[PDB]
């Protein structure tokens, strides 16, 4: 329908989400939406299949690459506070990288996966800081800087790591002691403390075994975050219109800058954005493997550009046992967060989210 109100919103959300849980055998999902800036919460199923613990808005889910939006915000915050400038060469912020290829890569290129073909993951044996440093120092670019986007955990991971170091604090400390408290996120973690473990969902693998995230070099930066729908929606609210800390406001704003595009998807810091309104087909294409699995030449921007409020900003994320999606449209006052403890297809996430956002826009 094209009617608004509480009744049609529930009919739509329940009607979209429930069949999807069944189709993909998703044990639990927490959903939260914004309509005209007002929040609505929908919880389904269980966080722990063994115990029967029900999902709530406080259940912690792994959000995979959605973590990169927080990593990017931390990076932006460091930039605002004077740790670095986006056009600085990476090696200006890493002495051990002087003389390497990172003499010719900018901090922005690193953050936006356009440094020149840094891979999706580190090679298998690169699993200590010393080995990581050797890896980057030795790395040889596949493409000229700024020309190709290849989604890469080593890329944005190094950006986060160096951004935090530019303020003289480790990444996890800056995140837990400053960024999350300033955003007012009090139940969001990289390392989940004992006191919060009771709310931590289990993920469920393709083999249907309970699983949680793998530790790793730069895992904090790449996929470190555990959070529930209520905290994640508050982070989304901060991205809709934030009035408070000027520095944090500036940092958030900087994550809405566009640097290049692949098709109709424009890459920012963390967030990837589209026109709004946008068709389901376009949103599916921009979130397809051909854009995330693979290297693509980019449509370059002459200069980075503030993308503004009339955009759909989004990010997908997954781990072995979890599947997350977040999208928001600042000008329209609408948003969706969908957190599940199964890694179910991105196409389904996008189709559900598009249907729900269409109803929220009424
Ligand atoms: Zn309508
Ligand atoms: Zn409601
Ligand atoms: Zn090792
Ligand atoms: Zn370091
Ligand atoms: Zn707190």
Q: Which residues surround ligand 1, an ion (CB under 5 A)?
A: 2
Q: Which residue has the tokens 């890469």?
A: 152
Q: Are 81 and 167 in contact (CB under 8 A)?
A: yes
DSSP-derived pairing of the beta strands 38-48 and 28-35: antiparallel
Which ligand number lies closest to the CA of residue 177? 5
Residue 85 annotated as lining a ligand binding site: no
Residue 161 annotated as lining a ligand binding site: yes
Whole-angstrom distance, CA of residue 79 vs CA of residue 114: 19
Residue 127 annotated as lining a ligand binding site: yes
Ligand 4 centroid to 310 CA: how many Å? 38
Whole-angstrom distance, CA of residue 229 vs CA of residue 59: 8
Structural biology method used: X-ray
Which ligand number lies closest to the CA of residue 188? 5
Long-range (24+ apart) CB contacts under 8 A made by 271-275 are 271/69, 271/72, 271/239, 271/313, 271/314, 271/315, 272/313, 272/314, 272/315, 273/307, 273/311, 273/312, 273/313, 273/314, 274/311, 274/312, 274/314, 275/310, 275/311, 275/312
Closest Cα to residue 166, out of 80, 78, 251, 283?
78
Q: What resolution in angstrom units was achieved for this structure?
A: 1.4
Kindly state the helix (H) or strand (E) to which residue 329 belongs, with its residue range: strand 322-329
Closest Cα to residue 110, out of 154, 51, 71?
154
Ligand 1 centroid to 4 CA: how many Å? 9
Q: Are 355 and 18 in contact (CB under 8 A)?
A: no
Ligand 4 centroid to 167 CA: how many Å? 12
Active site residues: 65
Q: What is the DSSP secondary-structure string of 45-96?
A: EEEETTTTEEP-TT-BEE-GGGHHHHHHHHHHHHHHTTS--TTSBGGGG-GG
Residue 229 annotated as lining a ligand binding site: no
Ligand 5 centroid to 235 CA: how many Å? 13
Q: How many other β-carbons are positioned within 10 Å of the β-carbon of residue 331? A: 13
Q: How far is CA 272 from the centre of its chain?
A: 9
Long-range (24+ apart) CB contacts under 8 A made by 286-293 are 286/262, 287/314, 287/316, 287/346, 287/347, 287/350, 288/346, 291/151, 291/262, 291/263, 291/265, 292/151, 292/316, 293/120, 293/151
Which residues lie across from 33 on neighbouring strands?
40, 336
Residue 362 annotated as lining a ligand binding site: yes
Whole-angstrom distance, CA of residue 93 vs CA of residue 326: 31
Ligand 4 centroid to 162 CA: how many Å? 7
Q: List Cβ neighbours of 254 (8 Å cut-off, separation of 6 or more).
A: 76, 79, 80, 269
Could you tell me where the DSSP H helices lie in the chain? 6-23, 67-80, 107-111, 129-138, 153-165, 171-174, 180-183, 219-223, 229-238, 246-254, 280-286, 289-292, 346-360
Closest Cα to residue 269, out of 225, 302, 332, 221?
221
DSSP-derived pairing of the beta strands 322-329 and 334-340: antiparallel
Which ligand number lies closest to the CA of residue 131? 3
Ligand 3 centroid to 127 CA: how many Å? 5
Kindly state the helix (H) or strand (E) to which residue 179 belongs, with its residue range: none
Closest Cα to residue 279, out of 197, 351, 193?
351
Which ligand number lies closest to the CA of residue 126? 3
Domain ranges of the chain: 1-362
Long-range (24+ apart) CB contacts under 8 A made by 197-200 are 199/47, 199/58, 199/59, 199/60, 199/228, 200/47, 200/59, 200/60, 200/226
Q: What is the DSSP letter of 338?
A: E
* CATH class of domain segment(s) 1-362: alpha beta
């Amino acid at each position: 329908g094209h009617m608004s109100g509480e009744a049609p919103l529930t009919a739509t959300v329940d009607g979209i989400i429930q069949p999807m849980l069944k189709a993909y055998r998703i044990p639990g999902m927490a959903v939260a939406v914004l309509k005209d800036g007002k929040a609505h919460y929908f919880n389904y199923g269980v966080a722990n299949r063994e115990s029967g613990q029900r999902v709530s808005e406080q259940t912690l889910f792994e959000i995979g690459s959605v973590s990169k939006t927080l990593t990017a915000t931390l990076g932006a915050y460091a930039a605002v506070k004077g740790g670095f400038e986006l056009d600085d060469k990476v090696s200006q912020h890493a002495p051990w990288l002087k003389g390497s290829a990172f003499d010719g890569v900018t901090m922005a290129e690193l953050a936006t996966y356009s440094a020149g073909g840094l891979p999706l993951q580190f090679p298998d044996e690169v699993d200590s800081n010393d080995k990581m440093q050797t890896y980057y120092r030795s790395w040889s670019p596949v493409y000229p800087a700024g020309t190709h986007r290849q989604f890469s955990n080593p890329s944005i991971g190094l950006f986060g790591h160096l951004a935090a170091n530019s303020l003289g604090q480790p990444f996890e400390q800056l995140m837990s002691q400053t960024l999350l408290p300033k955003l007012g996120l009090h139940h969001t973690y990289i390392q989940v403390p004992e006191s919060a473990m009771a709310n931590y969902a289990y993920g469920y693998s393709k083999e249907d075994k309970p699983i949680r995230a793998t530790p790793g070099v730069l895992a904090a930066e790449a996929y470190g975050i555990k959070t529930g729908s209520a905290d994640l929606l508050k982070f989304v609210e901060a991205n809709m219109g934030y009035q408070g800390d000027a520095a944090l406001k500036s940092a958030i704003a900087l994550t809405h800058t566009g640097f290049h595009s692949v098709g109709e998807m424009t890459q920012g810091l963390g967030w990837e954005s589209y026109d709004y309104p946008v068709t389901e087909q376009v949103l599916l294409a921009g979130n397809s493997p051909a854009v995330s699995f693979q290297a693509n030449p980019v449509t370059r921007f002459a200069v980075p550009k503030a993308m503004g409020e009339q955009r759909l900003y989004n990010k997908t994320g997954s781990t072995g046992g979890f599947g997350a999606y977040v999208a928001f449209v600042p000008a329209r006052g609408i948003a969706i967060v969908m957190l599940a403890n199964r890694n179910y297809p991105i196409e389904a996430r996008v189709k559900a989210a598009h249907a729900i956002l269409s109803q929220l826009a009424e």
